C-alpha cells in the first residue's frame, strides 16, 4: 500500500520502453549535424509537441528543464528581470510551493515589491485581494492550479478574468496535470509549470510552457540550447519519456481520475469515523488523489512510521518531520495552529492503487490512532 504519490512516482513501463533506445542505441546530441544528431532533434521535437498538446499549448512554446523546481525558478526570476522596466510589483499566493516562494524572496532583495495572497480556511486563494492589490506597475501574478498538500483546486479562470491582460499570469500545474483538465487557453496562462514524474514520466526533467510574446531572461547560462532560455546538452531520453507519459496521460486521464476519486471518497468516509478527525483543504473542490486529515492528541511522524511498519507509505505536515522543525507553511496559511498541524496525515493516491490497498489502510489505521492515543499525555 504505497500512499505517497505526491513525493515520487514509478515510471510506467510504457514510458520506460520508449526511453531505453535513446540511452544505448540512439544516444546522439540534438545539435550534432549528423544522422545521430538528426534522429535526436526529431525525437526532442516530437516530445515538445506531445507536451504542448497535453495542455493545448500551440499558442506558445515548451522549454524543457530539470524539473518543476527549475521551471518555477525560471518563470518567476526569468519573467521578472526581463520585464522589470514595466514595473517591479508581484503577487504570489501564500500556499505556493517553496520553488515559487523562494525565488519570490530572492526578488525582494533585488528591489521588487512582492505581496503574498492570503487564503481562507480551505486553502483557497483570496480573489478580492488580487483585485484590490493590483496596480499600474504589477507585472506578474503566480498562483498554483491546485495544492499538492491539501488538494484544494484554485480559482484560476476568475483570476485570469480579473487580471484581464494587465499582468502576466503564472500557473504552477505540477499537482493538476493528469488529475483534472489542464488547458492553458481555458485558464488564461501566460506561463505554466509541468512536471514529468507527476504524470509517471522519469524524474529529473520538466517543462515551463510560455505563451507567444511573453519574454523571459534565462537562469541557466551556457550554449544557447532551448533558444537561449535554458542551456545544456539535451537530456534526450528523459524528454522522450516525458513525451510518452504526456501521450499516455492525454488518452488515459479521465478514466484514471474517476477511479482515484472513488478510492479517495471511500478513504474519506471511513477515515472521518475516527473520533477527533478533521479534513484539511476543500471538501469538494479537491484533487481526485488527495486525502489530508488530522487526528487530535497525536504526532504526525509517529502516525507515518506506524503505518510504515504495517507496510503503508504516507506523509505528514508535522514540524517533527521537517529537519528545520517548522510545520508546513501551507497549513499555517490556512490558519491552523501549530498544535493541530502536528497530527496531520496526507495520503496521495496514484495509478497502481487497488481496492486491496484501501482495505489494508482501513484495517490498520484505527489501531494506530488508538495505540498512539493511549500513550499521549494529551488524551
Amino acid at each position: 500500500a504505497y500512499f505517497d504519490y505526491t513525493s515520487a512516482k514509478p515510471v510506467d513501463e510504457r514510458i520506460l520502453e520508449a526511453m531505453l533506445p535513446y540511452m544505448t542505441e540512439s544516444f546522439g546530441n540534438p545539435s550534432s549535424v549528423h544522422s545521430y544528431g538528426f534522429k535526436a532533434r526529431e525525437a526532442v521535437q516530437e516530445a515538445r509537441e506531445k507536451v504542448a498538446k497535453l495542455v493545448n499549448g500551440g499558442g506558445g512554446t515548451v522549454v524543457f528543464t530539470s524539473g518543476a523546481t527549475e521551471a518555477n525558478n525560471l518563470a518567476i526570476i526569468g519573467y521578472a528581470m526581463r520585464n522589470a522596466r514595466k514595473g517591479k510589483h508581484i503577487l504570489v499566493s501564500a500556499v505556493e510551493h517553496m520553488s515559487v516562494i523562494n525565488p519570490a524572496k530572492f526578488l525582494q532583495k533585488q528591489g521588487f515589491e512582492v505581496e503574498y495572497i492570503p487564503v481562507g480556511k480551505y486553502g483557497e486563494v483570496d480573489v478580492s485581494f488580487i483585485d484590490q492589490k493590483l496596480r499600474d506597475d504589477t507585472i506578474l501574478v503566480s498562483v498554483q492550479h491546485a495544492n499538492n498538500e491539501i488538494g484544494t483546486i484554485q480559482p484560476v479562470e476568475e483570476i485570469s478574468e480579473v487580471l484581464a491582460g494587465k499582468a502576466a499570469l503564472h500557473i504552477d500545474a505540477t499537482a493538476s496535470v493528469g488529475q483534472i483538465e489542464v488547458d492553458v487557453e481555458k485558464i488564461g496562462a501566460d506561463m505554466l509549470t509541468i512536471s514529468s514524474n507527476d504524470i509517471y514520466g522519469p524524474k529529473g526533467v520538466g517543462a515551463l510552457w510560455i505563451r507567444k510574446e511573453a519574454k523571459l531572461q534565462p537562469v541557466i547560462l551556457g550554449g544557447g540550447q532551448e533558444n537561449g532560455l535554458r542551456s545544456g546538452s539535451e537530456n534526450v531520453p528523459s524528454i522522450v519519456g516525458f513525451g510518452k507519459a504526456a501521450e499516455i496521460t492525454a488518452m488515459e486521464w479521465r478514466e484514471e481520475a474517476e477511479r482515484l476519486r472513488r478510492l479517495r471518497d471511500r478513504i474519506i468516509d471511513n477515515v472521518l469515523k475516527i473520533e477527533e478527525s478533521y479534513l484539511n483543504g476543500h471538501p469538494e473542490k479537491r484533487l481526485p488523489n488527495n486525502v489530508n486529515v488530522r487526528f487530535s492528541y497525536i504526532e504526525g511522524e509517529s502516525i507515518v512510521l506506524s503505518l510504515d511498519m504495517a507496510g503503508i507509505q504516507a506523509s505528514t505536515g508535522s514540524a517533527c518531520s521537517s529537519k528545520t522543525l517548522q510545520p508546513s507553511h501551507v497549513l499555517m496559511a490556512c490558519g491552523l495552529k501549530h498544535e493541530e498541524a502536528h497530527g496531520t496525515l496526507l495520503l496521495t493516491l496514484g495509478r497502481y492503487n487497488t481496492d486491496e490497498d484501501v482495505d489494508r489502510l482501513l484495517e490498520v489505521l484505527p489501531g494506530v490512532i488508538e495505540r498512539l492515543r493511549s500513550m499521549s499525555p494529551l488524551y
Partner: protein, 138 residues
Amino acid sequence: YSDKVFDHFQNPRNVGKIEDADGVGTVGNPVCGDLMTIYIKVKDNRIEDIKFQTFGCAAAIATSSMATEMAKGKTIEEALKITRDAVAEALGGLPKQKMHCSNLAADALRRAIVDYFRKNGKIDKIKELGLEKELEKM
C-alpha cells in the same frame, strides 16, 4: 534512525499512567511542541515502578521507552546518572536534530525524581545532588 529506535518505538516499554505516583515529571519542548510525563513509584529509595506518557515523534517514544527501561528497579542515585547521552548511546545514536528528543526523556525522568524529593521534604537532597537549577525551573 536505528534498529533499537525502531524496536522501542514499535514495542515501547512501560507505557501508561500511575495513580499513586510518588513522583511526577512533565516537560515540553519549546521548539517542536513535544510533551512528556514520567510516573515513578519509589519504595526503598528505588524506582519500584515507572510509566510514561509521551506526545512526540518516533525518537521521543524510543527515548522515553529506553529511559524508563534503564530506570526500572534502580536506586535513585543510579537513576540520576541516566543523562541524554546515555539514552542516545543505549539506542545506537540519534540523528543530530533528533537529539532534543532524548533530552526530553532525560529531563522528564530528572523532574519526576526532584518531584519525589519535593513532595517528601527531602529538599537537602535536591541541594546535595545539584538539581536546584532543575527544581527552580518549575
